[PDB]
Amino acid sequence: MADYLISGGTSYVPDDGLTAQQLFNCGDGLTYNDFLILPGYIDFTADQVDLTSALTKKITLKTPLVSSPMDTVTEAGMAIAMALTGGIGFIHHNCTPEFQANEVRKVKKYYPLASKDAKKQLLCGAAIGTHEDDKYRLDLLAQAGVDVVVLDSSQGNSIFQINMIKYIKDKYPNLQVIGGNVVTAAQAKNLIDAGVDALRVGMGSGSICITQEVLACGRPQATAVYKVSEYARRFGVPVIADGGIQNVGHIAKALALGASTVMMGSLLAATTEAPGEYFFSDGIRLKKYRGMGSLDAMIKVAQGVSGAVQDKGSIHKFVPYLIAGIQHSCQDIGAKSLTQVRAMMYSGELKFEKRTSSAQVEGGVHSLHSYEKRLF
Amino acid sequence: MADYLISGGTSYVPDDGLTAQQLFNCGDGLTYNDFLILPGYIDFTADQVDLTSALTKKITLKTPLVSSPMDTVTEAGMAIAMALTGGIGFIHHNCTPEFQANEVRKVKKYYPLASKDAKKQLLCGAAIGTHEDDKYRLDLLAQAGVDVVVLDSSQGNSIFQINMIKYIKDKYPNLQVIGGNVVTAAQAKNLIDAGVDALRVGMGSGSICITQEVLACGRPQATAVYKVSEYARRFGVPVIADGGIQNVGHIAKALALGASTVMMGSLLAATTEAPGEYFFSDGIRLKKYRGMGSLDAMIKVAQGVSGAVQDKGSIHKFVPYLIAGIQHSCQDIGAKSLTQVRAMMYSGELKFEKRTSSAQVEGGVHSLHSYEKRLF
Amino acid sequence: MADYLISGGTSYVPDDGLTAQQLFNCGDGLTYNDFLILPGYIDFTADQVDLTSALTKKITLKTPLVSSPMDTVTEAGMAIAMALTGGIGFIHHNCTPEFQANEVRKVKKYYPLASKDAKKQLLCGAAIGTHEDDKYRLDLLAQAGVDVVVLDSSQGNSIFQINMIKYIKDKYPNLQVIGGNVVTAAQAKNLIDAGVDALRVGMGSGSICITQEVLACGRPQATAVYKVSEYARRFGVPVIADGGIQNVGHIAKALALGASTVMMGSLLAATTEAPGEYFFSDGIRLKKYRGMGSLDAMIKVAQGVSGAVQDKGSIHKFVPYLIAGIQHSCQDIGAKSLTQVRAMMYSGELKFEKRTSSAQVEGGVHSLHSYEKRLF
Amino acid sequence: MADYLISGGTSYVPDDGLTAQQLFNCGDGLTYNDFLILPGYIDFTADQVDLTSALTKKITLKTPLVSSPMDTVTEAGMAIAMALTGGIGFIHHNCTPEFQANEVRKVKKYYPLASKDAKKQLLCGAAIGTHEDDKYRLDLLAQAGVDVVVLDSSQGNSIFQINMIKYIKDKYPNLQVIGGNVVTAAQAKNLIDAGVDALRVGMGSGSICITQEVLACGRPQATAVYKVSEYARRFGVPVIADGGIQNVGHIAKALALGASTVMMGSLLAATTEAPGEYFFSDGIRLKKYRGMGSLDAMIKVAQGVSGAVQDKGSIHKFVPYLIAGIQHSCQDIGAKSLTQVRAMMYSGELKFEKRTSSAQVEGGVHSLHSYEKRLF
Ligand SMILES: NC(=O)c1ccc[n+]([C@@H]2O[C@H](COP(=O)([O-])OP(=O)(O)OC[C@H]3O[C@@H](n4cnc5c(N)ncnc54)[C@H](O)[C@@H]3O)[C@@H](O)[C@H]2O)c1
Ligand SMILES: NC(=O)c1ccc[n+]([C@@H]2O[C@H](COP(=O)([O-])OP(=O)(O)OC[C@H]3O[C@@H](n4cnc5c(N)ncnc54)[C@H](O)[C@@H]3O)[C@@H](O)[C@H]2O)c1
Ligand SMILES: NC(=O)c1ccc[n+]([C@@H]2O[C@H](COP(=O)([O-])OP(=O)(O)OC[C@H]3O[C@@H](n4cnc5c(N)ncnc54)[C@H](O)[C@@H]3O)[C@@H](O)[C@H]2O)c1
Ligand SMILES: NC(=O)c1ccc[n+]([C@@H]2O[C@H](COP(=O)([O-])OP(=O)(O)OC[C@H]3O[C@@H](n4cnc5c(N)ncnc54)[C@H](O)[C@@H]3O)[C@@H](O)[C@H]2O)c1
Ligand SMILES: O=c1[nH]cnc2c1ncn2[C@@H]1O[C@H](COP(=O)(O)O)[C@@H](O)[C@H]1O
Ligand SMILES: O=c1[nH]cnc2c1ncn2[C@@H]1O[C@H](COP(=O)(O)O)[C@@H](O)[C@H]1O
Ligand SMILES: O=c1[nH]cnc2c1ncn2[C@@H]1O[C@H](COP(=O)(O)O)[C@@H](O)[C@H]1O
Ligand SMILES: O=c1[nH]cnc2c1ncn2[C@@H]1O[C@H](COP(=O)(O)O)[C@@H](O)[C@H]1O
């Protein structure tokens, strides 16, 4: 038995690759399509990967796909749509409080991926501001009975947001909050000590956000979702990644970096459950998609744009492709669960590699005349 | 009281980020849109940030927005316009000396942001050459009574410029000078020891300048405005950043690197207070904008181009947007003043992060079909 | 004889350059067009370079040019075509097993570059899947008498592939297998210990592959073909480089990094020996070229695209240009054989240099109006 | 006198910048438009800079501007044209030997920048091959009396070239040779020990050359012209920089890196003294420009392209702009001669800085609608 008593169970497993901390302490601000994940060993099929992920300290979901509360992406409609497929939705606060109240009543007065509560009503969350008049919003939201709320802000480290956190945690102890936006560990500490139940991480790296180009704030997305998640697991706090998502690759490598759920704003935009309706320009069927920092929210500054993106049909045909993509990525990484993927990442077993710009432009399609890219 | 006697007042504040000197001693020549500023903690509102900044050793301004003396951007017109909103203007020397004399008389013979002197006449500066015949310019400018002058040159380290500095500092002791252009600390020393009252830093990185591509001189702008400002505060000397400004983000992160005022050449071009008048090409209402190093200044070499840029209306609607942008950036950085921003930068409290090209191309708008970008 | 007794034979040979391990342990994921090979000393003509390379442990070839088994590039046709010029071909498994059986019979029932066996029948290989029903494929392939098989898979480190390797190495001892795809040394170990006779290295970096952009797996190609070949020569195992080949430069520097043969998928596509036939779009005579991970192979995910590329005529006029390109590159590197090129690489004598993006965009054609690029 | 006895003459001169060896031993393959030169101190006018540079060990020139021997750029015509303005020209060997003989007779049987010999005939050089039949070329060239010859080759380190060097240095001792192409110090040593009188450095980085993209050889240009010149001054050998020249900036920073003369192939192409004549495409008056490695020189490989570039008129109006550009760059660097520029470079006094891609794209013109770029 001498071949066992040298090391014990584990084979040699040569040291090719870079672990997470030697990748994100080189100082360079890497983003999603700037590194990539090296594979490992698989001993299991694609179908049996369990993507059960946690949203906050008491709310777990069957899929990590959550949506961002903008007025051009989610309502009660894609809320009930993602609640039917395991995710969660948040209702934007860019409306009257009574409209958000009857919106959050419409979803809870309403396929094995459950995401519904103890009394089999659907989990659904919402977004609330941080000004003093927003108390009159979320008290009516509690009468409607919302379960998790998002303290949506450009800067997550205000005196106003931590005062609001102290205002709900004494009044509403069962209710849970989502602090953000944070990008660094200092404001992550300054929210977690206030009693935040989960963070939403990432500012500036949105498909709409130009606040890096306008306010010079923020940081690259992947370094943020690594370092805030690395700090947040010290206290047992999940994080939520926003922005910089264009495909099923970015969300997979995003929650492989320590995130538990990922927040999809543009890639869930222009669906059949999205607000408004379709229109046409140059014969392309597309729906407008607009952030709050654009001046079309209602001496002001603008931190966002107004634009549009082509459609992708219903989510009920779209998010099974997303979970199949997460499912295949967590296959060929080599873990049977997302929890095992983060365990292999923080354990140093799962290894990465930095990627240069030429390997980026060869990572996609190249050296051909024309092509049709259909993902499913 | 044991929780106070371990450290004293200050909390933990984890070490996420890079301070300025570990960012600008890696050797890489970073520019403005190549790094970005990580946020901190705010405990104050947006309106009460005080952007009072110093121009030279006795001239302080209510806003750090100054303009560059080209013949296609400023006259007495945008001089009185920026004097009305706290800034300063300089009159280009590409004219006859009598024309610059009656120009600088028109501005001083002329809304709480003051920028006017002890006898309530407007602060206004001008630009003067460095050849021997320019003595007959600036002595008439002193009879007109200009307060600060800019020794405008491509290379700030001449024997001619320091001889000129010795020529005004014995004749005109109350008059103050602006040396430049410098990009490195050696010529910064060789001007400060001559008695320069403030520097203007940055060559080659202008929107017009091709002298990096033609004379192989200069350096990237952000490293220049960090290192010349880091040397210049040893002697209590402000610096002025030129070039590479396209937006309100670059000027904010520019004066966050140690600059006190920033010099806006192209982003203040094509206004209602700009010289000439508008014209049309392809139905776009645009005004020509041309530097001195172009051959259209009057065996010669050319260090600039002649071109045009689309308009932005009056500055009185435009620079309130700029000060609101500076105001929001200094908010979510976490300082109540620009002086506090530079104190947090040199103290190591304010931290930065390098940014890669993929995080640059995701920092702007991406992953959508079309958009309308309106900043205010 | 004192000039000999200081060192012995070898001259000074200054230390300009970087060897392979100091290039591929900096952590950066370099690819083919991101570094380049510094020249050495030549004492021989171009014609007498011997490009004899090994495919697996008993199969050697006269040229290292092998093709990839897709249904849009190779059949029996380009199999007999590359067997006539020293290479090898593999027949794609995306057909019925009887069709692959009569395909591999058509090639062996069939100009000094030989690549034919002991009984002067042509060497020709094929590709086989990894599912349980594929036993009924490769047993009929053995009745047809195929010599080397490729266990084609997206992830080379499955329990299924090593179980298949154990299933052929006890049944068919003379038959030889090609494991893959691997990119790292760990799965290279986990295939070599099973009894793999040669690897095929590189996933994601194909001209069709978007699985880096979709599944976030893989790594850059040149680092993979360096490190898997550096591990594989410990056990005397050749490797086969796939993907990222656009020209005769990439295959030359690819097999200079430790690869013995290189697998050409797109640059051998759209030939006269390619499947289907030509068609026209915009007046350009081009043939469709499609990978297996596209959904056009037959709730599914897609790891490839369907597209087309312009033609290059017959290979019998094309691969002499490729071997002449390899021949000239191995000339001005300074080795009389590919084996000597790998000996000079692992010995540290042959040296490399990293290349930046500006030197990349000047490495090609630049600073002119228009050009005609004809390679032969 | 205590202020003198601390250091002696020299002031403090702060350590901003990077010297040459800490820039070119970081391992990165920098090229011309990837770094730039920091300014110093000037105490002199633009007109009195002396750009006297050496070609080989006995041939000095009044300007460092030499041309490359291609059949689409130089003849006797631009030979007499550059001999009139201080430079040198070489006649391409892609013709019959009698045609090159009467070409080199036409130039010597023929404005203070002299470049003419002891008996006031014009200095003019030529290019000769390396095959055995080329002896019958250069012996007739010696009867015509050429002064310097270029052993033109893709790879400067052959047994054939050093045998040729031994063949002319015993026969023709007054005649001088130009070895090349070299990019590294090893082949620089292996030519200098043979008796080479000056090198020409740089392969692959030409405007025509695709041999980096085809043969995977070569290196970036600026690192080559630094390191080969750093080795070559150990033996007192000048080097000649080819390729990667688009402007007067690249040649200035090129000979600031240790080169004495620079070889201009494309930027001297399409002149009135260039071969063939003008033609029109899309209404642009342009002349074809083609390298030898293109297949249009006469089973072959191709290392070049055939193309065209727009015209620039006569050189007698063009190279005064080039020497004025060199003259202004050597002004604001801070040296009165090119020899002083190389003395300040190797002495560590002259300092550089690496430049990133964003500072590259801001180094040129940016942030405007349209522009007219006229250099003189
Ligand atoms: N990438 C991102 O995540 C991102 C980045 C920027 C903006 N945004 C979006 O922009 C929206 C608006 O952002 P915002 O926070 O700047 O707008 P806001 O109206 O919520 O706050 C405006 C400013 O007032 C301050 N503030 C907050 N509460 C206050 C109170 N009681 N009294 C006085 N001042 C108070 C804040 O500091 C803020 O700078 C957000 O809903 C967010 O979704 C998102
Ligand atoms: N990005 C920048 O800041 C930048 C860069 C380049 C040029 N420029 C613009 O280009 C304009 C002209 O630049 P310039 O200084 O090269 O033109 P200039 O006419 O002022 O000086 C021309 C040259 O003569 C020399 N000189 C100065 N005084 C002299 C004197 N008495 N006698 C003899 N020579 C003297 C200088 O060294 C200079 O190289 C400047 O006004 C500047 O605004 C700006
Ligand atoms: N750049 C590359 O080299 C590359 C990358 C990706 C895909 N591809 C191509 O895509 C093709 C298909 O790839 P694929 O392997 O994902 O498709 P597949 O049908 O061969 O395997 C599908 C999945 O089932 C699993 N599997 C294998 N054998 C199994 C078995 N008996 N039982 C249950 N599950 C089993 C595998 O893990 C795999 O994830 C391949 O032929 C390959 O050529 C190539
Ligand atoms: N950027 C550059 O500087 C560059 C790079 C590549 C090519 N080129 C141009 O391409 C031209 C041709 O280049 P080339 O040297 O490859 O063509 P060539 O005809 O001079 O040599 C062809 C090959 O034969 C070999 N050779 C030389 N002398 C020989 C001899 N007596 N006997 C047998 N073989 C011999 C050489 O090694 C060479 O690989 C050159 O004139 C050069 O100007 C320039
Ligand atoms: O108006 C805005 N200005 C800046 N960022 C925004 C704005 N609106 C939404 N965002 C961010 O963009 C994210 C959406 O991600 P994306 O659309 O997929 O890039 C949200 O979760 C927010 O963090
Ligand atoms: O003609 C020129 N050649 C080179 N630089 C110039 C010229 N004219 C102005 N500049 C510089 O460009 C700056 C203007 O900044 P910008 O236009 O906003 O890029 C000025 O402050 C000068 O430093
Ligand atoms: O469908 C696919 N999805 C992903 N990779 C593929 C697919 N088909 C072929 N490949 C890979 O692409 C390689 C071909 O190289 P290339 O076409 O020259 O880039 C093959 O050897 C495979 O490794
Ligand atoms: O045909 C060719 N193939 C590769 N390099 C060439 C060829 N012809 C000329 N060159 C190189 O290109 C240089 C000309 O520099 P450029 O045209 O200014 O880029 C010459 O000095 C040669 O070193």
* CA-to-CA separations, C374 to D66, D259, D303, in angstroms, rounded: 29, 33, 10
- State the DSSP H helix or E strand holding residue A190, giving kind and residue range, or none if neither: helix A185-192
Binding-site positions of A for K(+) read 204, 206, 209, 362-364
Torsion of CA D186, D188, D194, D198, to 10 degrees: 180
- Would you call A25 helix, strand, or coil by DSSP? coil
Torsion of CA A134, A140, A146, A147, to 10 degrees: 70
Give me the phi and psi of B374, to 5 degrees please. -115, 125
- In angstroms, the CA B199 to CA B14 distance is 36
CA of C153 from ligand 3 middle (Å) equals: 4
Ligand having the closest approach to the CA of D180 = 4
Give me the phi and psi of D325, to 5 degrees please. -65, -45
Catalytic hit among A26, A95, A124, A209: A209
Per CB-CB distance under 8 Å, the chain D contacts of B289 are: 368
Report how far apart the first and last C-alpha atoms of chain B are (Å, whole number).
Answer: 50
> Which pair of tokens denotes residue D353?
């800085």
Contacts of D1 (CB under 8 A, 6+ apart): none
Q: How far is D33 from chain B (nearest CA, A)?
A: 8
Q: How far is B202 from chain A (nearest CA, A)?
A: 20
Contacts of B308 (CB under 8 A, 6+ apart): B270, B281, B286, B287, B288, B289, D368, D369, D370, D371
Number of neighbouring beta carbons within 10 Å of residue C109: 12
CA of A212 from ligand 6 middle (Å) equals: 25
* CA-to-CA separations, B161 to B152, C150, C319, D37, in angstroms, rounded: 9, 75, 66, 21
Active centre residues of C (catalytic): 209
- In angstroms, the CA B355 to CA D284 distance is 41
Q: How far is C120 from chain A (nearest CA, A)?
A: 37
What is the secondary structure of D163-186 as a DSSP string?
HHHHHHHHH-SS-EEEEEEE-SHH
* Sign of the four-CA dihedral B326, B327, B330, B333: negative
Which of C29, C266, C281 comes nearest A354 by C-beta?
A: C29
Q: Do B301 and D328 touch (CB under 8 A)?
A: yes
Per CB-CB distance under 8 Å, the chain B contacts of A33 are: 358, 362
Per CB-CB distance under 8 Å, the chain C contacts of A319 are: none
Catalytic residue flag (residue B217): no
What is the secondary structure of D226-281 as a DSSP string?
HHHHHHHTTTT--EEEES---SHHHHHHHHTTT-SEEEESSTT-SSTTSSS--EEE
Strand partners, D54: D60
- In angstroms, the CA D310 to CA D278 distance is 9
Q: Are strands D198-201 and D176-182 parallel, antiparallel or unpaired?
A: parallel
- In angstroms, the CA D12 to CA D233 distance is 30
- In angstroms, the CA B267 to CA B131 distance is 30
- Which domains, from first to last, does chain C contain? 10-376 (3.20.20.70)
Q: Which atom of ligand 2 is nearest to the CA of B180?
A: 3
Resolution of the PDB structure in angstroms = 3.1
- State the DSSP H helix or E strand holding residue C128, giving kind and residue range, or none if neither: strand C125-128
Give me the phi and psi of C60, to 5 degrees please. -110, 150
* CA-to-CA separations, B186 to A313, B259, D40, D53, in angstroms, rounded: 62, 18, 7, 28
Mutation site, D225, D251, D353, D361, interface B, largest B CB count within 10 A: D353
Q: Are strands C279-281 and B306-310 parallel, antiparallel or unpaired?
A: unpaired
Q: Which atom of ligand 6 is nearest to the CA of B292?
A: 1
- Would you call C18 helix, strand, or coil by DSSP? strand
Is the CB–ligand 7 distance for residue C293 below 6 Å?
A: yes
- In angstroms, the CA C134 to CA C129 distance is 6
Rg (CA), chain B: 21
Per CB-CB distance under 8 Å, the chain A contacts of C310 are: 369
- In angstroms, the CA A292 to CA A71 distance is 8
Mutation site, D25, D181, D189, D217, interface C, largest C CB count within 10 A: D217
A49: buried, middle or exposed (CB in 10 Å: 19+, 13-18, 0-12)? Answer: buried
- In angstroms, the CA C262 to CA C269 distance is 15
Contact in structure between A260 and A54 (CB atoms under 8 Å): yes
Nearest Cα residue in chain C from A253: C216
Is the CB–ligand 1 distance for residue B38 below 6 Å?
A: no
- Would you call A251 helix, strand, or coil by DSSP? helix
* Amino acid identity at C65: L
Is the CB–ligand 3 distance for residue C207 below 6 Å?
A: no
Smallest CA-to-CA distance from A257 within A56, A32, A26, A28 is with: A32
- Cis ω before D174 (30° cut-off from 0): no
- In angstroms, the CA A251 to CA A262 distance is 6
Mutation site, D213, D267, D306, interface C, largest C CB count within 10 A: D213
Which of A28, A190, A214 comes nearest B41 by C-beta?
A: A190
Catalytic hit among D26, D209, D217, D330: D209
Task: Identify the residue whose tokens are 């140059």.
Answer: A282
- In angstroms, the CA D100 to CA C183 distance is 55
Give me the phi and psi of A12, to 5 degrees please. -70, -55
Find chains touching chain C: ≥3 CB pairs under 8 Å: A, D
- In angstroms, the CA A243 to CA C151 distance is 39
Number of neighbouring beta carbons within 10 Å of residue C40: 22
- In angstroms, the CA B218 to CA D40 distance is 10
- In angstroms, the CA D74 to CA D264 distance is 11
- In angstroms, the CA A141 to CA A90 distance is 12
Output the ligand 8 site: residues, CB below 6 A.
D 68, 70, 206-209, 211, 242-243, 245, 263-267, 291-294, 303-304
Contacts of D170 (CB under 8 A, 6+ apart): none
Which of D15, D44, D354 comes nearest B28 by C-beta?
A: D354
Q: Do A363 and C205 touch (CB under 8 A)?
A: yes
For B310-326, letters b (16+ CB in 10 Å) and e give ebbeebeebbbbbbbbb
Q: How many CB pairs under 8 A join C and D?
A: 185
- In angstroms, the CA A236 to CA A228 distance is 12
Is the CB–ligand 4 distance for residue C48 below 6 Å?
A: no
* CA-to-CA separations, D36 to B28, B248, C129, D333, D374, in angstroms, rounded: 12, 27, 55, 11, 22
Nearest Cα residue in chain C from A39: C217
Contacts of D80 (CB under 8 A, 6+ apart): D107, D110, D122, D124
Contact in structure between C100 and C141 (CB atoms under 8 Å): yes
Per CB-CB distance under 8 Å, the chain A contacts of C281 are: 369-370
Smallest CA-to-CA distance from C160 within C183, C110, C194 is with: C194
- In angstroms, the CA B122 to CA D66 distance is 57
- In angstroms, the CA B368 to CA A112 distance is 33
Number of neighbouring beta carbons within 10 Å of residue A58: 12
Find chains touching chain D: ≥3 CB pairs under 8 Å: B, C
- Would you call B261 helix, strand, or coil by DSSP? strand
* Amino acid identity at A267: L
> Which pair of tokens denotes residue D125?
């050089």
* Sign of the four-CA dihedral B187, B190, B194, B195: positive
For A246-271, letters b (16+ CB in 10 Å) and e give bbbbbbbbbbbbbbbbbbbbbbbbbb
Contact in structure between C188 and C182 (CB atoms under 8 Å): yes
- In angstroms, the CA D39 to CA B216 distance is 10
Q: Structure solved using which method?
A: cryo-EM
Residue nearest to atom 8 of ligand 2 (CA): B154
* CA-to-CA separations, B232 to B191, B245, B291, C168, in angstroms, rounded: 10, 22, 27, 75
Per CB-CB distance under 8 Å, the chain C contacts of D33 are: 358, 362
Local structure of residue D297 (DSSP, 8 states): G
